Design an enzyme around this catalytic site. Structure first.
Site, PDB file in Angstrom:
ATOM      1  N   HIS A  80       0.892  -1.143   0.000  1.00 53.93           N
ATOM      2  CA  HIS A  80       0.000   0.000   0.000  1.00 53.93           C
ATOM      3  C   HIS A  80       0.932   1.194   0.000  1.00 53.93           C
ATOM      4  O   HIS A  80       2.072   1.093   0.458  1.00 53.93           O
ATOM      5  CB  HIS A  80      -0.847   0.045   1.270  1.00 53.93           C
ATOM      6  CG  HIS A  80      -2.046  -0.847   1.235  1.00 53.93           C
ATOM      7  ND1 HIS A  80      -2.387  -1.668   2.287  1.00 53.93           N
ATOM      8  CD2 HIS A  80      -3.008  -1.019   0.296  1.00 53.93           C
ATOM      9  CE1 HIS A  80      -3.507  -2.308   2.000  1.00 53.93           C
ATOM     10  NE2 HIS A  80      -3.906  -1.933   0.798  1.00 53.93           N
ATOM     11  N   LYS A 110      -3.962  -0.254  -8.213  1.00 50.06           N
ATOM     12  CA  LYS A 110      -5.131   0.609  -8.242  1.00 50.06           C
ATOM     13  C   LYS A 110      -4.866   1.813  -7.352  1.00 50.06           C
ATOM     14  O   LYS A 110      -3.997   1.772  -6.479  1.00 50.06           O
ATOM     15  CB  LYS A 110      -6.370  -0.145  -7.738  1.00 50.06           C
ATOM     16  CG  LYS A 110      -6.306  -0.543  -6.268  1.00 50.06           C
ATOM     17  CD  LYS A 110      -7.580  -1.251  -5.821  1.00 50.06           C
ATOM     18  CE  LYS A 110      -7.583  -1.479  -4.313  1.00 50.06           C
ATOM     19  NZ  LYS A 110      -8.801  -2.206  -3.861  1.00 50.06           N
TER      20      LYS A 110
END
EC number: 4.2.3.-
Length: 215
Positions: A80, A110
């Site tokens: 992340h 994403k």
């Protein structure tokens, strides 16, 4: 017989091979959208080999290389990236060249569409990017060269963000990261127990993939 079993039995070998490899170079892409463009991907869009989409029923703009470079099956490893909320667009643009690079080891990722989520929610405060990692070999085992490439990549993202003066966001409580990663954090739900909190993070830190990425 699994991806992780292989990492455990070749723990030191992979690390020794990795540390001896030369720095990796990533040819950054220029024909990529900026953050606003990314948000406008709609049903379908394409930028330098990566298929994009931002469906109305989701809050993330997905990017996937039509031609996956890794042939193994996803084993749960992912990163992340957390940056200050007001800097998501700046951070995106700064990392766009690498994220769309023909050399990137990341086939799928994403980024959160900040206009779709509540400013106060944690989704807006950190983990605005997700990078999915999957073993490069068909037998689903990570090769030393791929692990090295992945680590070099992640460290390249770290340096680009710091060099652009991007401010760190709030790392998710479910992830783990070493002191030298100011934006990146790691997580693997495939093996994150049911306890969460401290117990979960400690389990992650013992994961061979994470240790190979940080030691």
């Amino acid at each position: 017989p699994s991806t992780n079993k292989h990492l455990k039995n070749n723990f030191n070998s992979l690390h020794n091979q990795m540390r001896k490899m030369p720095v990796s170079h990533f040819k950054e892409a220029l024909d990529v959208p900026d953050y606003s463009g990314m948000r406008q991907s709609g049903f379908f869009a394409m930028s330098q080999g990566f298929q994009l989409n931002n469906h109305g029923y989701d809050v993330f703009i997905h990017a996937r290389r039509e031609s996956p470079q890794s042939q193994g099956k996803f084993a749960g490893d992912k990163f992340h990236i957390s940056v200050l909320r007001d800097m998501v667009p700046q951070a995106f643009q700064a990392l766009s060249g690498l994220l769309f690079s023909e050399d990137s080891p990341v086939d799928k990722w994403k980024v959160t569409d900040m206009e779709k989520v509540v400013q106060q929610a944690r989704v807006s405060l950190g983990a605005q990017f997700t990078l999915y990692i999957k073993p490069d070999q068909e037998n689903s085992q990570y090769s030393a060269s791929f692990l090295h490439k992945t680590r070099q990549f992640i460290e390249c993202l770290e340096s680009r963000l710091s060099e652009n003066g991007v401010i760190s966001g709030q790392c998710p409580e479910s992830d783990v990261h070493p002191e030298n990663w100011k934006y990146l954090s790691y997580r693997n739900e495939l093996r994150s127990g049911r306890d969460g909190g401290e117990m979960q993070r400690q389990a992650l830190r013992e994961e061979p993939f994470y240790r190979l990425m940080t030691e």
